[PDB]
């Protein structure tokens, strides 16, 4: 607990019963109303009897204080949630937010000190790339005055207020929960200017002076408000400073102001109208279709739903509906295509709705109990198509044969001849004679994989309590009776790691033998899900240990075995799209429908009566929705078999459960799609992405036909196919609702945005709403926060935002983050030794916030990252950035000498080989990472599980260090090769499993209580943060000089001189080899060329360059026209040979190569030598871009080979073309057409001063005695030693 801070971001749902219980025990009169008064009844009974404890006493004290304070406002009135959103989103106070206002003012002044030189430095990059010797005036003004806009936005005061409240509540929680201290100081109000505020451990009270309203909030509500307000602030600031969203700004402002006004009157049902904002965007996008009969199909349903939800609550008058429709029209109707996928990102800026358990229980009980009627011919036709698919799948991979395959009885002569001759068959034959497959029988032809991996078992989940203790999760305070104790553990990972007798083909027998239908400990229970925008929404279920293991095993079996067979006058093809959702199918499935396929799978795999366990178990159990604050209406503990089919229980369900058996369901659905395709006479292509499903329908037509007629014919045939498919699915008994799917001829929605007719629309403003002032870690880490900020900014850049504005925003956010972490924190180790000198010295802070991270600073965004996706070498790129800053006069000139004569750290060959590119910095790691590694290795060492035996010993670290030393300590150091070898060796697998094991606060606290972390380590990790600021201070204040350094030397030479000094204790003057490649933005010049000029200014002799060309007209919006013996190789011999390849094939090093390979495989020297390939030594693709589809890249003038051999891209060649395309994009960003003339782009390159006269040495003879483990490991999961 001493090293675990409370949460900083909402990760839980909002339950009404929590607030209701807190207020009921504090005895404060409220105005909530529940659907089931069981909680109030239980609490009243308990209070009448005389229960009491520490929480009750504390809440009684707080309630007495509140009651005493409320006597000065004789006209108060509680306002529930979310009826208080319009007020709490605009609250403000002047006195209580005094501390942070001065910090942010200081940050704004610090930024304004250097914003000018920041712009001056950003302009030279444009001047070099060739986009003109000057930026745009508005852009210059925004970059200079970025602070004033952010400070003048309309969310500043609410943001300040909510940040203050959140951090104060977190400090209270942390300082109190550590029960070593006992004395409790009762809380007291704090009279502000406009409001009055009271903060306690688990209850916040706010009183408004003027209107005399009263609000009571909890921790989750506080976190939610803070997140929402900060997101709104960042998004509005971005849209204001940019000049492309000038019309989107007004629309989204009006949307906020309109919808916010509905809360005080409507109430909680407003979130239904909020959730309706996502499909309305697609409905309004449909209006731009080309087949006029389609315009309005989905809109006619959305409007009906909105009218009905507005009518069912008392607003029956038509004026309200009419005005709301007018407002929605004004909001959504637009003209540009790219600016309609943005509203897709704002539907989470209103919060989340409060929910109960009774409503969800009823919503799922409505579906779990419903009779159906199904026809038989359609089922059999689907089954026939299924068998045909499987037949063809196995005919492939073997070649025209059915050796272990089916055994027909009275089939048609065509089918019999097909089997006899060994040729495939089409859907037509199967669907025409399905009667021939009524009685077929397969034979076992698939093996079982029982030592594949461990991810499935190692992923963390939860387990429900045993059946005879089902009510052990409800605390004693909310129940009318005292429950029985809870015994079993509640973590799959620790139950697994402590299971002393585990066997994969033993759970399989536990299912096959029919013992799971009599286990008196089976139990299943539902629990609520957070961060949804629907009351009913979703849930997720928990089961018991054995059944969870069996489910995982079965689904992995399917996904690894058969599931691969389902891979997914000039005429031409046209296509249309159908988009639907796939939820509630798990509720609509049934035994009578799934058994016909489960039986084929049983006969194929061998396991008798296996793949239909879910229904056979659920048809006799009793489910319930569990939540600690929603107790059941009972009087004494009764078995789960005597509750009524009622409030929170679901007795004897019929359907399935989301998540489980999903592979079986998705491979059993497809045949009906193909059946409808055959019945209609078209060709289809399917795709499934989570819950969405897309079906593309294709049809052949002549070429010279007009575009309109083409699309119209495609749409007609697609509508026909849709009608037929709906009619078919209704027979087996699913539900394709006639007004819940989108039929279109232009677009379909998949994971990353909306694909619109050969082009993807942007979603730029999504990550800006996430870049915030902390990050999810068990402690508070400034470096983690800054790295997350840089990551979100780069991800937003690559979706359409502006590079320079994003860079400046990143700089400002980094400065503010450093200031907040130094001056406004809940940490207790920040003392006067660092906080006073740093907060006093101004320029030192600016330099620390501007210096790049890989060489000491805290800025995690290099300039080349704005253009390319991956830079070559972080060290040389950061040195180039520092040189650019020094040139542009942003930082003093001695910073180079300081950073090049800083003091080295202390790491070992293992750390170097595990992070090859790193310099030897001081205390730059991550606390959460360093803690997770230790706790995972410790908990793995003590594990009697027979599946991982001999894989973890107390000497593993020693052997790893010795192996790394033997690999690296030669007369020439090759960190990349060492890293590859060590990654592929056994240590790689060890650490990979350790990292795959995902541990969190629960397991960490459990292991600490066990005693896995010593006091020395916990104190070091508690002090780790302040040491970083100390190191930064001493680095930036040091003063030495390196007389062999002038700031015009090459970045490569500078990086060499830095590495050969920071690694001086281990290298001992030996040359480090093959690490750095030249920087992008320092070795490339650009030049545009137009009507009649030539590349004069860059044609002084440089005659090698890339060539780009792009003519067009009105466009950019819409277009109108080696043995390798095919075996189980992927087990470990892949690794065993890749290691040997990376090692080499020299004179006698083959002995050691074979040694380290035979370590992880069972091969001989000659077999390895004949199975490994030989090489030369020991060792385009685009992004979201509009204009990329119009250019004609050429590189004939630049293919010049330096180092004089046809090699891999000497310089990473794709980077040149990527930079060129980026330049063209940022040139044609904010206009409509390419213009009149033709623009051609020269991209010249001269990487001559950045060359290394490296010598390709034959091989580096080792100087050490190889010594590995005495005996090898024969564990089949790890790379075995007897596979072959």
């Amino acid at each position: 607990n001493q090293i675990l801070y409370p949460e900083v971001h909402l990760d839980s749902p909002i339950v009404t019963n929590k607030i209701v219980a807190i207020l009921e025990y504090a005895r404060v009169p409220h105005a909530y109303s529940l659907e089931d008064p069981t909680l109030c009844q239980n609490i009243k009974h308990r209070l009448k009897n005389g229960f009491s404890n520490q929480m009750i006493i504390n809440n009684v004290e707080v309630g007495n204080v509140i009651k005493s304070k409320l006597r000065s406002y004789p006209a108060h009135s509680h306002i529930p949630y979310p009826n208080c959103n319009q007020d709490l989103f605009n609250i403000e106070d002047k006195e209580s937010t005094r501390k942070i206002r001065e910090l942010l003012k200081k940050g704004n002044s610090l930024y304004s000190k250097v914003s000018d030189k920041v712009f001056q430095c950003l302009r030279d990059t444009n001047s070099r790339l060739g986009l003109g010797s000057e930026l745009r005036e508005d852009i210059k003004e925004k970059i200079i005055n970025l602070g004033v806009y952010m400070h003048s936005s309309q969310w500043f005061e609410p943001f300040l207020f909510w940040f203050t409240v959140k951090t104060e509540m977190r400090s209270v929680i942390k300082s109190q929960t550590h029960t070593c201290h006992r004395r409790r100081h009762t809380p007291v109000f704090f009279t502000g200017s406009s409001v009055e505020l009271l903060i306690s451990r688990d209850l916040v009270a706010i009183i408004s002076k003027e209107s005399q309203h009263v609000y009571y909030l909890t921790f989750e509500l506080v976190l939610m408000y803070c997140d929402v307000i900060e997101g709104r602030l960042m998004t509005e600031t971005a849209m204001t400073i940019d000049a492309r969203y000038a019309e989107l700004l007004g629309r989204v402002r009006y949307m906020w102001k309109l919808i916010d006004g509905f809360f005080p009157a409507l109430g909680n049902p407003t979130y239904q109208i909020v959730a309706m904002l996502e499909p309305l965007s697609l409905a309004y996008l449909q209006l731009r279709d080309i087949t006029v009969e389609l315009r309005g199909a989905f809109l006619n349903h959305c409007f009906t739903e909105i009218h009905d939800v507005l009518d069912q609550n008392g607003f029956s008058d038509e004026g309200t509906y009419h005005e709301l429709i007018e407002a929605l029209d004004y909001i959504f109707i637009t003209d540009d295509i790219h600016l309609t996928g943005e509203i897709f990102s704002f539907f989470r800026s209103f919060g989340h709705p409060r929910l109960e358990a009774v409503t969800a229980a009823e919503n799922v009980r409505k579906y779990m109990n419903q009779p159906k009627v199904i026809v038989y011919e359609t089922l059999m036709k689907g089954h026939a198509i299924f068998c045909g698919i499987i037949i063809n799948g196995y005919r492939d991979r073997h070649g025209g044969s059915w050796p272990p395959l089916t055994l027909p009885l009275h089939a048609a002569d065509t089918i019999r001849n097909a089997q006899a001759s060994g040729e495939g068959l089409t859907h037509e034959q199967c669907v025409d004679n399905w009667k021939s497959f009524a009685g077929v029988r397969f034979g076992c032809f698939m093996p079982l994989s029982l030592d594949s991996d461990l991810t499935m078992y190692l992923k963390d989940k939860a387990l429900a309590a045993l059946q005879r203790e089902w009510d052990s999760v409800y605390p004693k305070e909310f129940l009318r009776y005292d429950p029985p104790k809870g015994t079993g553990s509640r973590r799959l990972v620790d139950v697994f790691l402590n299971d002393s007798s585990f066997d994969p083909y033993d759970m399989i027998m536990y299912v096959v033998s029919g013992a799971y239908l009599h286990d008196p400990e089976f139990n299943l229970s539902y629990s609520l899900k957070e961060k949804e925008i629907k009351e009913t929404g979703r849930l997720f279920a928990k089961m018991t240990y054995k059944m969870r293991a069996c489910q995982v095993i079965a689904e992995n079996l399917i996904s690894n075995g058969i599931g691969k067979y389902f891979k997914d006058e000039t005429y031409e093809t046209v296509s249309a799209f159908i988009t639907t959702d796939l939820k509630k199918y798990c509720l609509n499935w049934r035994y009578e429908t799934i058994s016909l396929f489960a039986q084929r799978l049983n006969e194929i795999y061998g396991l008798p009566s296996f793949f239909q366990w879910l229904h056979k178990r659920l048809e006799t159990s009793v489910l319930y929705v569990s939540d600690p604050h929603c107790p059941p209406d009972l009087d004494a503990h009764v078995p789960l078999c005597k509750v009524p089919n009622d409030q929170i229980f679901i007795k004897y369900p019929m359907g399935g459960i989301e998540g489980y058996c999903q592979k079986l369901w998705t491979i059993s659905t497809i045949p009906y799609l193909y059946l409808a395709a055959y019945e209609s006479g078209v060709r289809i292509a399917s795709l499934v992405q989570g819950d969405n499903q897309t079906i593309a329908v294709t049809k052949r037509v002549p070429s010279t036909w007009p575009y309109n007629l083409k699309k119209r014919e495609a749409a007609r045939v697609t509508r026909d196919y849709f009608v037929i498919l709906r009619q078919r699915l209704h027979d087996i008994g699913h539900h394709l609702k006639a007004n819940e799917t989108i039929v279109s001829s232009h677009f379909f929605v998949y994971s990353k945005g909306i694909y619109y007719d050969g082009l993807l629309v942007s979603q730029s403003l999504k990550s800006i709403a996430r870049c915030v002032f902390w990050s999810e870690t068990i402690v508070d880490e400034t470096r983690a926060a800054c790295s997350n900020i840089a990551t979100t900014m780069a991800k937003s850049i690559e979706r359409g935002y502006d590079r320079y504005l994003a860079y400046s925003l990143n700089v400002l956010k980094v400065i503010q983050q450093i200031l907040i972490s130094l001056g406004f924190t809940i940490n207790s180790t920040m003392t006067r030794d660092v906080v006073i000198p740093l907060l006093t010295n101004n320029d030192l802070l600016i330099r620390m916030a501007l210096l790049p991270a890989p060489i000491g600073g805290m800025n995690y965004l290099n300039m080349s990252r704005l253009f390319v996706r991956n830079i070559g070498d972080p060290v040389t790129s950061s040195i180039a950035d520092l040189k650019r800053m020094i040139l542009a006069s942003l930082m003093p000139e001695e910073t180079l000498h300081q950073v090049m004569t800083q003091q080295p750290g202390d790491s070992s060959f293992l750390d170097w080989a595990s992070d090859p590119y790193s310099a030897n910095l001081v205390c730059v790691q991550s606390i959460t990472r360093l803690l997770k590694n230790i706790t995972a290795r410790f908990v793995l060492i003590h594990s009697p599980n027979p599946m991982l035996k001999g894989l973890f010993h107390d000497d593993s670290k020693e052997e790893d260090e010795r192996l790394a030393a033997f690999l690296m300590d030669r007369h020439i150091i090759v960190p990349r090769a060492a890293h590859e070898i060590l990654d592929h060796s056994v240590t790689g697998a060890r650490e990979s499993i350790a990292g795959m094991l995902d541990t969190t606060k629960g397991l960490i606290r459990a292991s600490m209580r066990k005693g896995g972390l010593t006091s020395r380590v916990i104190t070091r990790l508690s002090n780790y943060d302040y040491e970083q600021f100390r190191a930064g201070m001493v680095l930036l204040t040091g003063r030495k000089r390196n007389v062999l350094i002038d700031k015009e030397s090459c970045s490569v030479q500078l990086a060499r001189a830095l590495r050969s000094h920071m690694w001086a204790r281990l290298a001992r003057g030996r040359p480090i080899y093959g690490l750095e490649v030249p920087d992008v933005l320092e070795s490339m010049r650009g030049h545009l060329i137009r009507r009649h000029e030539t590349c004069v200014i860059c044609e002084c002799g440089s005659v090698n360059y890339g060539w780009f060309f792009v003519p067009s007209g009105c466009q950019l919006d819409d277009i109108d026209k080696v043995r390798a013996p095919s075996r189980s190789l992927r087990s470990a011999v892949r690794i065993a040979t890749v290691y040997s390849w990376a090692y080499g094939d020299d004179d006698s090093s083959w002995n050691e190569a074979w040694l380290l390979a035979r370590q992880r495989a069972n091969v001989s020297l000659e077999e390895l030598r004949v199975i490994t390939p030989i090489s030369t030594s020991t060792n385009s693709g685009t992004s979201l871009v509009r204009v990329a589809r119009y250019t004609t890249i050429s590189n004939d003038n630049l293919s010049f080979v330096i180092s004089d051999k046809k090699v891999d891209t000497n310089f990473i060649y794709q980077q040149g073309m990527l930079l060129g395309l980026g330049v063209l994009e940022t040139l044609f960003r904010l206009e409509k057409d390419t213009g009149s003339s033709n623009t051609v782009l020269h991209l010249h390159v001269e990487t001559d001063c950045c060359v290394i006269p490296m010598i390709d040495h034959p091989r580096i003879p080792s100087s050490r005695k190889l010594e590995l483990r005495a005996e090898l490991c024969t564990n089949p999961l790890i790379y075995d030693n007897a596979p072959l």
């Binding site: 209006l287 009969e293 309005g296 199909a297 006619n300 109707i333 509508r719 007004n739």
Partner: protein, 142 residues
Amino acid sequence: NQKIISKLESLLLLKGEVESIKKQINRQNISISTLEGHLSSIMIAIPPDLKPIIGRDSGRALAEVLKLLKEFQLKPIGKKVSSAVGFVPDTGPASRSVIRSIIKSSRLEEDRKRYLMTLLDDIKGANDLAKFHQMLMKIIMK
């Protein structure tokens, strides 16, 4: 001769296999009679007038057989009521709004949009509404 007499009498007395196979075929007939009787008894008129039905157990069909006029099946969608296939107006208040939205999102002239809205505010009736929609389609997509 003697061979004639013997090889005539043999078969002409062992003829009895004909009455034996007639026994066989009458047994087959009486066994299929009850089969088709059971299959007739399993069902009577039903939405066709004959579609046999069976259930998981014997008596678990009394919840979907009467509501013998079983239940409501899938509702057929044509070219008269709106669905995801195409849009047709009707008397409800949503059709006027979606027509207004089509007019607004069209590519016509502003005064033309005003003219169409003025015609629409007094157009009344299902048939006249459908006629106005059919004319508007041509006007906007021409």
